[PDB]
Design a binder for this molecule. Sequence first.
Ligand SMILES: [Mg+2]
Ligand SMILES: [Mg+2]
Ligand SMILES: [Mg+2]
Ligand SMILES: [Mg+2]
Ligand SMILES: [Mg+2]
Ligand SMILES: [Mg+2]
Ligand SMILES: [Mg+2]
Ligand SMILES: [Mg+2]
Ligand SMILES: [Mg+2]
Ligand SMILES: [Mg+2]
Ligand SMILES: [Mg+2]
Ligand SMILES: [Mg+2]
Ligand SMILES: [Mg+2]
Ligand SMILES: [Mg+2]
Ligand SMILES: [Mg+2]
Ligand SMILES: [Mg+2]
Ligand SMILES: [Mg+2]
Ligand SMILES: [Mg+2]
Ligand SMILES: [Mg+2]
Ligand SMILES: [Mg+2]
Ligand SMILES: [Mg+2]
Ligand SMILES: [Mg+2]
Ligand SMILES: [Mg+2]
Ligand SMILES: [Mg+2]
Ligand SMILES: [Mg+2]
Ligand SMILES: [Mg+2]
Ligand SMILES: [Zn+2]
Lengths: 113, 50, 81, 109
Amino acid sequence: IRDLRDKSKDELLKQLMEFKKELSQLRVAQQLGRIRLIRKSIARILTVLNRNQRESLRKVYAGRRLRLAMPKALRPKLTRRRRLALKDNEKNRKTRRQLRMARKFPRRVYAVK
Amino acid sequence: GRFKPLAIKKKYAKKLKQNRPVPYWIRLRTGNRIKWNEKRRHWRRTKLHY
Amino acid sequence: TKGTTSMGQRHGRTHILCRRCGRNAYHVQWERCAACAYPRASRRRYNWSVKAIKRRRTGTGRMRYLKEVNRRIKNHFKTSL
Amino acid sequence: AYTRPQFRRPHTYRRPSMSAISNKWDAFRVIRYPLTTDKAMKKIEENNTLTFIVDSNANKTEIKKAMRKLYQVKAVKVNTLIRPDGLKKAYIRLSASYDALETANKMGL
RNA sequence: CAGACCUGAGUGUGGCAGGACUACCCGCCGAACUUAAGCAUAUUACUAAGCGGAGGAAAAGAAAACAACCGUGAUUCUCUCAGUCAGCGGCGAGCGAAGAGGGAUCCAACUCGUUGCCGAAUCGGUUCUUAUAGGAACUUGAGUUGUGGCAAUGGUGCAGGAAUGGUGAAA
RNA sequence: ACUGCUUGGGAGUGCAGUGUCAAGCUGGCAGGUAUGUGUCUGCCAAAGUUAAAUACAGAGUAGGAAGACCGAUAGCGAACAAGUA
RNA sequence: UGGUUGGCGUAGCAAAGAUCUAACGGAACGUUGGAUACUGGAGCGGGGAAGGAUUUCGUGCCAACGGCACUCGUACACGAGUUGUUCGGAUACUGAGCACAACGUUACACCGUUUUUAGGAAAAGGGGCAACAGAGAACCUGGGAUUAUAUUCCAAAAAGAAAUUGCAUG
RNA sequence: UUACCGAAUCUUUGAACGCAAACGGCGCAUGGGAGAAAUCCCCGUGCAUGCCAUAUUUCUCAGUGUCG
Ligand SMILES: [Mg+2]
Ligand SMILES: [Mg+2]
Ligand SMILES: [Mg+2]
Ligand SMILES: [Mg+2]
Ligand SMILES: [Mg+2]
Ligand SMILES: [Mg+2]
Ligand SMILES: [Mg+2]
Ligand SMILES: [Mg+2]
Ligand SMILES: [Mg+2]
Ligand SMILES: [Mg+2]
Ligand SMILES: [Mg+2]
Ligand SMILES: [Mg+2]
Ligand SMILES: [Mg+2]
Ligand SMILES: [Mg+2]
Ligand SMILES: [Mg+2]
Ligand SMILES: [Mg+2]
Ligand SMILES: [Mg+2]
Ligand SMILES: [Mg+2]
Ligand SMILES: [Mg+2]
Ligand SMILES: [Mg+2]
Ligand SMILES: [Mg+2]
Ligand SMILES: [Mg+2]
Ligand SMILES: [Mg+2]
Ligand SMILES: [Mg+2]
Ligand SMILES: [Mg+2]
Ligand SMILES: [Mg+2]
Ligand SMILES: [Zn+2]
């Protein structure tokens, strides 16, 4: 099945149609054992074949400039809330005064003998 | 009569092929519980009013 | 003749199956569902009948995606690159 | 220069505005399995007519195009029915130039 | 009058909202049965149902607080205060707390507006640095019908840990 | 002020409606019996955020620990293809 | 709540006139022939709506069910079966009506108007729905074509004959 | 095969959102496909409303609003 991944796009597509054309013929035979084994090989090719496209659209939209333009099926789904929540990038923001009054009095470590 | 939305025909079609005796070989499995189908339907009795 | 002879007088349907709930509760003449309250967006839900709230709440079905997102929150949404 | 009793909003300019195999429908999804009942065996020999359970959402023109591709043969007509069971069933009649018998046996039937 | 602004549209663009859940929680709504040996105020109950909303809790919270002390010091909670020689009440049935005190928690506090001193220092977008940096250049784009400051981090790298799992004893 | 609900809150606990509508040059609010007045005490409202201790009283997700509990007419309606027939 | 009981092999199974015969079948009611009646065209007729939804058909079956019996069944099991350019429906009418939008009201839209204090044209009065009996609506017969479908199937002499829609073609 | 989890797949719907809906109906636009003497046919994607932002190369406009 590693061999199934070495195949290029059309080499998969050609490898795929011969499965469907042969999966169909088992269905003809059925009306009158390998059908499962075929059906799951077709699923392997769509797995490998649907991966190269998502792996090549993450490639098209790689880089900050286009990452906002990414198809959202490819955009990192979390939960609706993890996405709408403030990111640490904007969560940990503190007003400039606070920023200074935290540097001026850092949580200095201490002990009491 | 003739009239059926296909959605209703798909449902009576659903209940129709669902209206079958349990396979013989299912009863022969280990730990099997099922004997008769408990959801056999008959048009003259239970009504699938669609 | 309010009994068995007037049972023959009744011929229609008040309710067909709903497009949402699938209940035979879609009042065809008032195109709405008595059960889900459909086509209204918010589904019908009353606290005086929790036996019915319970009956059709989440987990009553496949929870088809919710199983996926639950597994993910448990795994910190761990991801392959 | 308005000449209607009531105002109407002006035309304003308006700017014009992942599966590797997006088309999931297919000759192989359309046609499923040939049917081998004896009403259908009456048609292959007597009517030059292959019978198929075929995808229920498929239409007739798609079933022609699918027979043309799966079994390499023209379908002079394809009158489908959807079975009480819910499967769709096409009786496809072949062109006289194509035998429905030579083809069905070629098909393993 | 060309534009300008103000007001308002139309598309394009990028987003969000709507649903579910709703035990708990926040807002409104709001009964009656019951009890009073009747019953209307009362009680049930500021409950149920109803509507609307959150979150992992919520709400509350940093004094327009208590006290009246040798004074305490946000909120929540808890034990108690206290079924009260408080109080409400056909002063009837009934209802009914708060301060203090012990404790839990707590290195718990902050931010605006304003005032004063400045006055675009701001923001958005674009590019950029291995970065939609708290960086930089650039932008009329927003913004002086007032952003912001003053006083009253991002990028990249290594590791360990912890935690989960995986493995693993006697006879 | 009036009204209405509300509260133990009692010549008003909170609120709402409507009318009215301040002060900050003896300020304002609280000081649990109204009023006018004088002292004193604490506070500084009408903008905002904020963990923990708390709820889970018919929720969920993923786990776990239990029981002087029930023991198949019991325990959940459901020990079973149960919110199923 | 479950089971069981006497009554009790009882009360009944008495509405719509009805069967008879032979042959065969079968382990023993059906099938055919004949006889005999009945329905009596507002039919125990032939098609449809609603409704039902596999009851259809064939083979088998008759354990259970068909309140007697069954060899038979609308029962059981298995396998089949419903074919459309023209039928009906939608595509494509409007109607009593309904209601999205907007707007308004409401503590709240799950209300109301049904156009909107309203800029609704995207290449004067927004959008939609609502009739299988209204409007609309291009197809007919023959068949030797089925176990079961036919105005749907038929095959090149299409049994055939049409009409009709779209595009294109001389 | 079992267990788990990253990659996907996830049909019709449903808040359901292109318009409808007892219709497996119908669009407009975009790309694809088959195909075919184009018409038809399948497919993908977009296309609801409201609101906020923006027009970053600063969109097009409307007002006997204000001026110039
Ligand atoms: Mg009946
Ligand atoms: Mg029906
Ligand atoms: Mg009555
Ligand atoms: Mg009537
Ligand atoms: Mg048809
Ligand atoms: Mg909601
Ligand atoms: Mg009483
Ligand atoms: Mg309630
Ligand atoms: Mg909070
Ligand atoms: Mg708060
Ligand atoms: Mg305190
Ligand atoms: Mg009380
Ligand atoms: Mg400022
Ligand atoms: Mg009260
Ligand atoms: Mg103040
Ligand atoms: Mg039990
Ligand atoms: Mg007797
Ligand atoms: Mg007669
Ligand atoms: Mg029969
Ligand atoms: Mg049966
Ligand atoms: Mg009308
Ligand atoms: Mg219509
Ligand atoms: Mg008509
Ligand atoms: Mg017609
Ligand atoms: Mg017939
Ligand atoms: Mg839709
Ligand atoms: Zn419904």
